[PDB]
Write an enzyme that holds these catalytic residues in place. Structure first.
Site, PDB file in Angstrom:
ATOM      1  N   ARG A   1      -4.695  -1.030  -7.614  1.00 41.47           N
ATOM      2  CA  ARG A   1      -4.870   0.269  -6.956  1.00 41.47           C
ATOM      3  C   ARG A   1      -4.616   1.366  -7.974  1.00 41.47           C
ATOM      4  O   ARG A   1      -3.584   1.372  -8.639  1.00 41.47           O
ATOM      5  CB  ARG A   1      -3.904   0.406  -5.773  1.00 41.47           C
ATOM      6  CG  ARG A   1      -4.153  -0.618  -4.659  1.00 41.47           C
ATOM      7  CD  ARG A   1      -3.123  -0.568  -3.533  1.00 41.47           C
ATOM      8  NE  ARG A   1      -3.379  -1.600  -2.526  1.00 41.47           N
ATOM      9  CZ  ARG A   1      -2.665  -1.775  -1.414  1.00 41.47           C
ATOM     10  NH1 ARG A   1      -1.634  -0.981  -1.142  1.00 41.47           N
ATOM     11  NH2 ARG A   1      -2.966  -2.766  -0.580  1.00 41.47           N
TER      12      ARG A   1
ATOM     13  N   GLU B   1      -3.484   4.707  -8.465  1.00 46.60           N
ATOM     14  CA  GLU B   1      -2.789   5.919  -8.034  1.00 46.60           C
ATOM     15  C   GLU B   1      -2.689   6.912  -9.185  1.00 46.60           C
ATOM     16  O   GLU B   1      -2.454   6.532 -10.336  1.00 46.60           O
ATOM     17  CB  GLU B   1      -1.399   5.609  -7.474  1.00 46.60           C
ATOM     18  CG  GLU B   1      -0.646   4.516  -8.198  1.00 46.60           C
ATOM     19  CD  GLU B   1      -0.527   3.243  -7.377  1.00 46.60           C
ATOM     20  OE1 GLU B   1       0.216   2.340  -7.805  1.00 46.60           O
ATOM     21  OE2 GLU B   1      -1.159   3.144  -6.302  1.00 46.60           O
TER      22      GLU B   1
ATOM     23  N   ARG C   1       8.512   3.506  -7.505  1.00 43.68           N
ATOM     24  CA  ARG C   1       8.271   2.541  -6.423  1.00 43.68           C
ATOM     25  C   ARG C   1       6.895   1.867  -6.389  1.00 43.68           C
ATOM     26  O   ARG C   1       6.630   1.059  -5.494  1.00 43.68           O
ATOM     27  CB  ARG C   1       8.524   3.197  -5.059  1.00 43.68           C
ATOM     28  CG  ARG C   1       9.930   3.760  -4.853  1.00 43.68           C
ATOM     29  CD  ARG C   1       9.960   4.727  -3.668  1.00 43.68           C
ATOM     30  NE  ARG C   1       8.923   5.750  -3.793  1.00 43.68           N
ATOM     31  CZ  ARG C   1       8.968   6.777  -4.640  1.00 43.68           C
ATOM     32  NH1 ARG C   1      10.013   6.940  -5.443  1.00 43.68           N
ATOM     33  NH2 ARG C   1       7.941   7.616  -4.721  1.00 43.68           N
ATOM     34  N   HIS C   2       6.013   2.206  -7.326  1.00 44.83           N
ATOM     35  CA  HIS C   2       4.691   1.581  -7.348  1.00 44.83           C
ATOM     36  C   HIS C   2       4.037   1.478  -8.731  1.00 44.83           C
ATOM     37  O   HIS C   2       4.367   2.227  -9.652  1.00 44.83           O
ATOM     38  CB  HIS C   2       3.749   2.283  -6.366  1.00 44.83           C
ATOM     39  CG  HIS C   2       3.351   3.663  -6.785  1.00 44.83           C
ATOM     40  ND1 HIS C   2       3.602   4.777  -6.012  1.00 44.83           N
ATOM     41  CD2 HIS C   2       2.673   4.106  -7.870  1.00 44.83           C
ATOM     42  CE1 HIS C   2       3.087   5.844  -6.599  1.00 44.83           C
ATOM     43  NE2 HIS C   2       2.517   5.464  -7.727  1.00 44.83           N
TER      44      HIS C   2
ATOM     45  N   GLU D   1       9.466   1.062   1.799  1.00 46.20           N
ATOM     46  CA  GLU D   1       8.507   0.132   2.383  1.00 46.20           C
ATOM     47  C   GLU D   1       8.178  -1.012   1.423  1.00 46.20           C
ATOM     48  O   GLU D   1       7.828  -0.776   0.259  1.00 46.20           O
ATOM     49  CB  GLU D   1       7.218   0.860   2.740  1.00 46.20           C
ATOM     50  CG  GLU D   1       6.256  -0.010   3.512  1.00 46.20           C
ATOM     51  CD  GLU D   1       4.829   0.474   3.431  1.00 46.20           C
ATOM     52  OE1 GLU D   1       4.606   1.650   3.074  1.00 46.20           O
ATOM     53  OE2 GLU D   1       3.925  -0.335   3.719  1.00 46.20           O
TER      54      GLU D   1
ATOM     55  N   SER E   1       3.601  -4.207   5.147  1.00 44.42           N
ATOM     56  CA  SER E   1       2.920  -3.612   6.297  1.00 44.42           C
ATOM     57  C   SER E   1       1.943  -4.641   6.846  1.00 44.42           C
ATOM     58  O   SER E   1       1.367  -5.424   6.089  1.00 44.42           O
ATOM     59  CB  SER E   1       2.152  -2.351   5.898  1.00 44.42           C
ATOM     60  OG  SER E   1       1.133  -2.645   4.960  1.00 44.42           O
TER      61      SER E   1
ATOM     62  N   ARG F   1       8.008  -4.785  -5.076  1.00 46.87           N
ATOM     63  CA  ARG F   1       8.789  -3.933  -4.184  1.00 46.87           C
ATOM     64  C   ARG F   1       9.906  -4.729  -3.501  1.00 46.87           C
ATOM     65  O   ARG F   1      11.013  -4.224  -3.343  1.00 46.87           O
ATOM     66  CB  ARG F   1       7.890  -3.239  -3.152  1.00 46.87           C
ATOM     67  CG  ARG F   1       7.310  -1.916  -3.642  1.00 46.87           C
ATOM     68  CD  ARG F   1       6.350  -1.310  -2.620  1.00 46.87           C
ATOM     69  NE  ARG F   1       5.140  -2.120  -2.450  1.00 46.87           N
ATOM     70  CZ  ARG F   1       4.642  -2.505  -1.275  1.00 46.87           C
ATOM     71  NH1 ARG F   1       5.238  -2.157  -0.143  1.00 46.87           N
ATOM     72  NH2 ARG F   1       3.558  -3.268  -1.231  1.00 46.87           N
TER      73      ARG F   1
HETATM   74  N1  LIG Z   1      -3.985  -5.106   4.116  1.00 48.41           N
HETATM   75  C1  LIG Z   1      -2.768  -4.278   4.360  1.00 48.41           C
HETATM   76  C2  LIG Z   1      -1.609  -5.214   4.707  1.00 48.41           C
HETATM   77  C3  LIG Z   1      -1.882  -6.015   5.968  1.00 48.41           C
HETATM   78  O1  LIG Z   1      -2.069  -5.390   7.044  1.00 48.41           O
HETATM   79  O2  LIG Z   1      -1.925  -7.260   5.889  1.00 48.41           O
HETATM   80  C4  LIG Z   1      -2.423  -3.406   3.169  1.00 48.41           C
HETATM   81  O3  LIG Z   1      -3.105  -3.429   2.142  1.00 48.41           O
HETATM   82  O4  LIG Z   1      -1.426  -2.699   3.357  1.00 48.41           O
END
Ligand SMILES: N[C@@H](CC(=O)O)C(=O)O
Lengths: 438, 438
Positions: free
Chosen positions: B214, B216, B222-223, B361, B364, B412
């Protein structure tokens, strides 16, 4: 959860007990005074039996309305009987249709109508509904587990190196270029330089199982543009034979795990996976060229043994040694990478090796050149610029122990293990010259 | 091999027996009637004692020639004694110098002279020679093993899906555009579309641990632009709580394995890792906003809970609920992806959740929208084109069971578990806005 047990998890102790099964409608047989519903899950089929006088009337009329591939859930009483082909049946109390399937299906999950490979790849979710395809991916998961388990039991630590790189390489071909903000980068083809650098850290025994990328301009049944490589590097070795011994024991461990744990899958594939016979035969490059010469395949000393050569050799080793697995070693130094250590007493040959499974190379490795000055000279001999590998060479100047390792192709390992004709049969979503989707 | 035992593998049972140890030169005490040599391996230090009256003259003269960080191998007799600070010493019979180190070193292995993070990252081979750094990486490897073992114990099959894709798996911006021959492609931000497609295959319970990318625009602690994600998807669920239950048991298993198997590393880090208490508290987005309101942090309903909001909430939960880990759920549907299932009886809220660890976090997930037509409408609601998702959507048309899953960040998870100040401390070669090499 809509289910409490899979078809395979229902045993004799559950006789007369209520369970909950779920899956896809395999078959429905409305035979008048009695009806049958067969549900398919990842492990097999479950028989749901409905005698008119023993089931709810709404349930009796619901059954014939069910269609192929509908996702349903059933709660009922387990009943062991000789009449049931799989040993038991479920006398239904409640049947719930979770999701209805459209028609026609993209592929025939019953296997009558065969489909082309590209059709199967475009519809992988349908393809795995066939036992023989599911069997392959269950075996793939088992292979990965067995490999990691062996590494752990032998003191190896799992590491993770970068896939986005901007460093030099020996070949400079088939690299996937990409932009990284303002800079230019590439996708990694191997963690080679990184795993060697970590041999100067004290980690000593490392392994990494991650994807590697190669932009091959032409397709083959043996490779893909995206692959899962099982890499390892080990320090404080005395020669490359210590690395070969570890590799063969690793591969043998994976093969035996499949034989013990996946007998059902092997049977479904009508395949007899042979018990490994350690140690595997070692065949020097010189000896390999001699054997091939007598078979009509003439390779000038110094260059690589090609596709046809490996095929002829694999067949030779099977006929003469009953060996599906064997090593090729003591390769010409000119035919191998600058990071391989030459035999000090015979510089024309080096400490590199390749493992062949059913005539196809599944792994290559060897003892590396840990002595900085010699390594620098070997880069020069390859006609490359040492200054381009500075970040790497730096790790050889502050106490670098002797070391060696290998790169084992996961796809090639499984393809050869199961004697499958195409590498696309062992990875869910292949990437090649013309395939970027799904 | 040049070693038979690591410093930590020598115990009482081997007293008086010959062993072979190897490592880097830590300290040399050059005295007239005796010489002391300490070498460091991945587990610690080992003392080599050479009295003039008991060792070979050549060995006696060799020791004072050794320098810091030289790699050596020693064969000798184990001798347990109260006189040795570490409980035992090795009486040397043979010493071999495998490789010599240059000076000055890129970093200080003694820990006396501190170096900035950037210098340490530029010299990872040197950095891991320090017990505190090596400790993090041994723990990282343990976490990966614990996670996989838990998945296998619960019937999950490992899968591997493509990292080079045509359709952005997570959205706009923070995406790495890459050329795939003639086609335009991107590096995958998530295996989301693929793990869902597999829910229609019968696999039912899958997991994948692989890199994600990704792009950013800003650097944070944190990333990173390259990370390792632990993904999972499971079918036949009735609600997102079934997924949350599995995720907490998984994370708990990982924490307990580290507490149980890496006590020594935790001690080196001078850190107390808490015993997980299940079930973790579940806090609705509405309730989280109410709590923040009490603390004077006003967040208009529908908007994201920012970094500051997360800190305050994590602090509140830690100090008031005794929970370093807790879930945030029932988020506003507008704030979550098109693939999340909304609450049918209250559409402005969805079946999505986030797992917070020490106010940050780490994961998710949620229950997905498996109903084809509704899914297509949600893709439209996000301003996206349903045709661009043909391969994905097709999987929801021929019998697709209810399903859900999660994406758990490996870096994380480890950074938060050990309460480390920077995410760059838990991955060997970080990729950020300004870091591309090594
Ligand atoms: N695909 C979601 C994670 C998930 O819902 O499995 C994300 O990239 O945050």
């Amino acid at each position: 959860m809509y289910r409490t047990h899979y078809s395979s998890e229902i045993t004799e102790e559950l006789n007369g007990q209520k369970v909950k099964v779920a899956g896809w409608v395999w078959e429905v047989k409305d035979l008048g005074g009695i009806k049958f519903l067969w549900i398919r899950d990842r492990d097999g089929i479950v028989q749901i039996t409905a005698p008119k006088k023993k089931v709810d009337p709404e349930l009796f009329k619901l059954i014939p309305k069910l269609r192929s591939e509908d996702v349903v859930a059933v709660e009922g009483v387990v009943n062991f009987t000789p009449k049931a082909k799989l040993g038991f049946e479920i006398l239904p109390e409640k049947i719930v249709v979770l999701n209805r399937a459209e028609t026609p299906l993209p592929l025939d999950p019953t296997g009558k109508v065969k489909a082309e490979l590209d059709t199967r790849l475009d519809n992988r979710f349908m393809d795995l509904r066939r036992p023989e395809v599911m069997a392959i991916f269950k075996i793939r998961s088992s292979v990965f587990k067995a490999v990691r388990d062996f590494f752990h039991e032998n003191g190896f630590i799992e590491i993770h190196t970068p896939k986005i790189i901007a460093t030099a390489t020996e070949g400079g071909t088939e690299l996937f270029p990409m932009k990284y903000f303002e800079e230019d980068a590439f996708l990694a083809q191997s963690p080679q330089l990184y795993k060697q650098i970590m041999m100067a850290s004290g980690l000593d025994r490392v392994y990494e199982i991650a994807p590697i990328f190669r932009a091959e301009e032409h397709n083959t049944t043996r490779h893909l543009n995206e692959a899962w490589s099982i890499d390892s590097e080990m320090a404080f070795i005395e020669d490359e034979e210590e690395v070969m011994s570890f590799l063969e024991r690793l591969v043998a461990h994976a093969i035996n795990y499949v034989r013990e744990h996946n007998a059902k899958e092997l049977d479904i594939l009508n395949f007899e996976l042979e018990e490994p016979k350690l140690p595997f035969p070692r065949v020097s490059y010189d000896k390999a060229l001699e054997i091939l010469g007598d078979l009509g395949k003439e390779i000038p000393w110094g260059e690589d043994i090609d596709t046809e050569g490996e095929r002829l050799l694999g067949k030779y080793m099977m006929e003469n040694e009953n060996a599906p697995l064997y090593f090729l070693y003591q390769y010409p130094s000119e035919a191998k990478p600058f990071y391989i250590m030459k035999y000090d007493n015979k510089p024309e040959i080096c400490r590199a090796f390749d493992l062949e499974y059913r005539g196809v190379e599944i792994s290559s490795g060897g003892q590396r050149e840990h002595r900085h000055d010699i390594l620098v000279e070997q880069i020069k001999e390859k006609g490359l610029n040492p200054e381009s590998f500075e970040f790497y060479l730096k790790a050889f100047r502050y106490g670098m122990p002797p070391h060696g390792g290998f790169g084992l192709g996961a796809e090639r390992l499984i393809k050869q293990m199961l004697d499958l004709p195409n590498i696309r049969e062992v990875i869910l979503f292949p990437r090649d010259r013309r395939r970027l989707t799904p």
